[PDB]
């Protein structure tokens, strides 16, 4: 077996920037090192075959060098479509092995999330369940925070979250959060608050609603 190693597993870079992902091998590979690209949604397409250098009909800003153990793929001009995960893979000995990967991100202006909270639907209440959805969308950087305060109190229980991969048309991220409870406890309070804390506002962007108001 041959252990393929990719140094940085994640990489952030600004548009236009050149970028060089390096993949190392357990020993000489006689130059049998390929390069692939897996954008989100699992779609993968090769990039270079034989020890880099060689393409397949893909963009010309992709290239790669490499000798025996140290090869490396290079992106010359970064386009807002190059955001994906890049792997390497030697097809010399057996079994065929891949590197760990390298998620490439495109640094872009710090923005704030657009929040939106939503009350249980008429439909789910009929079923004895109360779920409160809050959306924190199109923000950057990806590190943001979310807290629920029911009638001025704590979350921690009944909240499930879900972050998205960076968008490919505006290098932004978005988060969804869901406070769930039994319709029964939903009716025991009046104020429900989605408190989001990012680093673009020295004060948490807040959305919330009450129950008799509706």
């Amino acid at each position: 077996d041959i252990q393929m190693t990719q140094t940085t597993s994640s990489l952030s870079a600004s548009l236009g920037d050149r970028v060089t992902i390096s993949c190392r091998a357990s020993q000489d590979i006689n130059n049998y090192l390929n390069w692939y690209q897996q954008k989100p949604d699992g779609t993968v397409k090769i990039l270079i075959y034989y020890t880099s250098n060689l393409h397949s009909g893909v963009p010309s800003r992709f290239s790669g060098s490499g000798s025996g153990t140290d090869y490396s793929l290079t992106i010359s001009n970064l386009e807002q479509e190059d955001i994906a995960t890049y792997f390497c893979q030697q097809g010399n000995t057996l079994p065929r092995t891949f590197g760990g990967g390298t998620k490439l991100e495109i640094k872009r202006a710090d923005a704030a999330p657009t929040v939106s909270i939503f009350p249980p639907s008429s439909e789910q209440l009929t079923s004895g369940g109360a779920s409160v959805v809050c959306f924190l969308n199109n923000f950057y950087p990806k590190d943001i925070n979310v807290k629920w305060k029911i009638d001025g109190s704590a979350r921690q229980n009944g909240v499930l979250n879900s972050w998205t991969d960076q968008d490919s048309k505006d290098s932004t991220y978005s988060m969804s959060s869901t406070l769930t409870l039994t319709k029964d406890e939903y009716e025991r309070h009046n104020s429900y608050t989605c408190e989001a804390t990012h680093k673009t506002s020295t004060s948490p962007i807040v959305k919330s609603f009450n129950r008799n108001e509706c």
């Binding site: 049998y32 390929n34 692939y36 699992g42 779609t43 993968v44 397409k45 090769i46 075959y49 034989y50 397949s56 995960t85 792997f87 893979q89 097809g91 010399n92 057996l94 079994p95 065929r96 092995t97 891949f98 760990g100 990967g101 657009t114 939106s116 909270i117 939503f118 009350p119 249980p120 639907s121 008429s122 439909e123 789910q124 079923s127 369940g129 779920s131 959805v133 959306f135 969308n137 499930l160 979250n161 879900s162 972050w163 998205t164 978005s174 988060m175 969804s176 869901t178 609603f209 108001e213 509706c214």
Partner: protein, 216 residues
Amino acid sequence: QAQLQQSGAELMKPGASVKISCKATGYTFSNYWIDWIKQRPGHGLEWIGEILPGSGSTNYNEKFRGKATFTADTSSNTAYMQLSSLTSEDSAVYYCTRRGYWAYDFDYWGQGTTLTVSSAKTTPPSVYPLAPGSASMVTLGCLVKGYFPEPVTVTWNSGSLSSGVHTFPAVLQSDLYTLSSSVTVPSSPRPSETVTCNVAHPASSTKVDKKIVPRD
């Protein structure tokens, strides 16, 4: 446009087996070898084995050995991979590829199939609509709760609305998944006009349409 139509069965109880299917049309099926790769959500892209359609051939990974077996079929042009003694770790996304003779690269990848080993009863995604509650751009939503196994297909306006849309990965809470999607539009559009998120779920062959209507 040479490619490989993939997607075998996605759900079988632990302790049984399946046969992910891989159709490769767009070149001469028996000329080049085929590859089967594995990608568990822990982002590891493991190389399973490889078969040459014309012969019998094969080179398995001394790991998935006994765990996988590559089936021919020169006739229809479809490669197969049966996985047995299935457990929670075989649950992952499997890829089939074509290797290009001369150099050992995988030039054309299929869209991979997602396998789910589990003894959980399939269940219809309950769909509730997310409509703004506090009386330019407004965001609305669809909450798809309690559904197994994956996946579902969420769209807005039979495909007509695709920008300002956001569908978040699901979350297993307790045997059931629950996912939601959001879609933003200019204020004028709604509720001045209709906005409906159609969610699909083959597992239960359920296909629902829920339109967002003012004041919850």
